[PDB]
Subunit: 213 residues, 4 copies
């Protein structure tokens, strides 16, 4: 029969957008189309507030916006564990945690856009051993993005190439490069972002006065 | 003070998508940003069933899907008058009708994507006199689309150039080229189109068995 | 053995751009990849000056620019026959013309971007009999373009879906949406279009005062 | 009178492509449009071979390809200084080097795509003092790219927003997203990349067996 799969998306979700959500749907249809997997759940894990140089809305709000965005989803939920930790946590550790949570066990795979695959090449960003454990022990489902060539990223990285069977490249013939950075700027200018991010998220942002100049 | 404006979008809406909806929002913010207009309403007018060579879902359903898509909009409504006529009607006639309906009168403008502006150049598609009345007596608000250069379309058409003050070019720094043709194909294959078109529209399509192979 | 193929691209080429050229390369690689064909020649056929409601550069200029653009190509050539006819000609007639020449046998296929497939749906634009002859007698090689879904255009066309064996969809893994309308506007504003169209074409345009 | 400007693009150029070249043309036109500057020179500075976790073609090859790509440019040149250093150098040091040479005065500005602005946010990638020196001592000219919002990157950076007078956002009205990674993969598969990168660069690549 089919191997059960849980998809984990780690990211900022500042705020969660229709594209972040579309990523799950495209990935699920892709895995199902292979004939060997059955996606039983998706998890949105917002990053901790201590992360990066960029100023993010409080994780309390990013978790809230995801929960509200996911109310019309019957298979994707937000998990705040990662954001509730005292500090930022390398992605491989978040995978380990959720794998333990599942502990005939479904395979847990990291879901991301092709741009993340490119960041694996950034000096000192990801430890080689972590890249290895991510693709070998968990798996990667990557959704295409304009200007990125995942196939080449895989061919040019010895670690990815060696475990390419555990990397699933998905993509849809659509162009949807709405950036959350633009969303925040537009919101700051009083412009509409309706139909780019969920109606429920816009309501929360308005009610809590988020992303103001 | 500001000139009141009603935006009319004529099209197939087979089915209405998040991009069709985004078009209204981008256009409204653009007109408001000029400082001289106040958009008070938007109208989605699905095309008649006798139109074109392409097979469209019944207008009864396209009107229903738009109504449901617009339930969370406080300023855009669907108007079935055009689709209820015995036969297809040139766009200038639909504008005339809605102008009469409004009859200190707000300006009624045709809302469309830049690709429509390009179709004005198609032999025998639009009567020169209609193109003229559309831009001169009503107005055009055009939203940018990848691969189209509205500014050049305007410069190269003597009629548009002469009335360019009545043509408003809007666009947002986003890439969103999701085609309804892809939506229908995906739906026909059992794939998800969630987050590309409204949740309410997907529910109607599923409940009424639309767009099946 | 592989089937010999000649690719014919009909269009304005006002002016020819790197995108138009790229279309040939992608189509050829796709056809060779199928293992069933051997593309032996490419033909750029600029449209006549009476065509449409547009002020196009004179046909002899568009032919000359295409020729310059193709100097570094060892398999694509421009053919002025079509532009040199007294009047505009439906595309199927251009295919028939070039088919006859080939006979004086390779298969002749129309080469176009996905957007062209969408124009097949435009009321009164293409005669149904002509769409049928194109995909039934000849063939169609389509290069993808952003915002277009060729697979859906084919499936929804009662004529195209019955001839898929003669339709070849070559996907463009790169994003190359450079509009010739934009090229003309930029040129008219005195802005650079270098690296968007061939250097020799830019020079010709300058020398002859085109698009000013 | 207009302020003399020299544009410096640091990058892999593995290999140089039509997009990299287009970036210079768009930036120059944008700067001239402001009416305040006169771009007098463009400089392509390929990165050293010790840089990053990537198997890059040898620096002398990337320099040679850039030189060939630029033969038809009357204002852009490749400078191998950087690639010829014993080790990789932070970009601000390359700017200082080229600034000194200019002195042996024109303003030297870093030229990059919008994506570079986003990398400024990457933990430990760029020293804050360096980002400050780049936009405060020199200048930054950014060319738009699909999926990136430079205006937001600037507004959200406590360093960039304080130096907007020295940041110039040049918008790319065309869609030109051709990945050098894709170019390399296509080449390795024996597929054409003609019209995506200069002909002379393709020839050099073939002659020297690069990307096989
Ligand atoms: N463990 C490590 O060493 C290490 C190093 C760097 C980053 N990280 C992790 O990586 C994450 C960084 O997330 P982020 O700030 O980029 O998240 P984000 O909110 O910007 O995006 C979330 C996800 O959406 C995808 N996405 C966004 N727009 C898309 C589109 N249009 N199409 C397809 N996919 C799209 C992104 O690729 C990403 O996978 C964090 O969880 C961080 O902890 C880990
Ligand atoms: N009066 C005439 O002579 C004449 C001739 C031809 C067509 N028409 C009219 O034109 C309409 C044709 O509509 P259609 O079939 O193209 O409608 P459609 O459903 O495909 O699209 C509706 C609108 O959405 C815009 N749009 C779609 N995707 C977009 C995106 N990603 N970004 C921005 N805008 C986007 C389109 O430009 C269009 O204005 C009909 O109302 C028809 O009656 C009139
Ligand atoms: N026989 C008929 O009934 C009929 C009806 C309408 C048009 N036509 C013919 O169709 C042609 C119309 O040509 P045009 O004005 O669009 O020519 P054009 O110069 O704009 O483009 C020529 C070709 O390039 C392709 N192309 C352009 N940019 C591209 C990109 N970025 N990526 C991929 N492909 C790209 C186009 O799809 C087209 O196939 C003429 O030859 C005309 O006679 C025939
Ligand atoms: N000093 C530091 O701390 C530091 C840290 C990281 C990187 N760097 C430097 O940054 C550079 C990294 O270069 P790279 O590997 O990205 O080079 P690259 O060859 O990929 O590209 C070079 C330039 O082209 C631009 N570009 C590419 N495709 C484009 C397109 N389609 N449209 C517009 N612009 C486009 C890129 O944005 C970039 O500015 C190196 O010089 C490196 O030393 C410096």
């Amino acid at each position: 029969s089919r191997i059960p799969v849980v998809l984990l998306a780690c990211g900022s979700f500042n705020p969660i957008t229709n594209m972040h959500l579309r990523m799950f749907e495209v990935a699920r249809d892709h895995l199902h189309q292979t004939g060997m997997y059955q996606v039983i759940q998706g998890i949105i894990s917002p990053v901790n507030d201590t992360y990066g140089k960029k100023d993010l809305a409080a994780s309390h709000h990013r978790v809230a916006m995801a929960r509200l965005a996911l109310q019309t989803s019957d298979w994707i939920r937000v998990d705040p564990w990662e954001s509730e930790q005292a500090q930022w946590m390398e992605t491989v550790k978040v995978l380990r945690h959720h794998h333990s949570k599942l502990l005939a066990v479904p395979e847990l795979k990291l879901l991301c856009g092709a741009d993340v695959l490119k960041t694996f090449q950034t000096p000192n960003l990801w430890k080689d051993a972590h890249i290895q454990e991510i693709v070998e022990k968990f798996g990667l489902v990557c959704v295409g993005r304009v200007s990125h060539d995942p196939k080449g990223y895989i061919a040019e990285s010895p670690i990815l190439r060696m475990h390419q069977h555990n990397i699933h490249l998905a993509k849809e013939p659509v162009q949807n490069e709405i950036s959350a950075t633009y969303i925040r700027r537009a919101l700051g200018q009083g412009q509409s972002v309706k139909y780019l991010i969920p109606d429920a998220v816009i309501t929360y942002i308005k009610d809590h006065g988020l992303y103001t100049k």
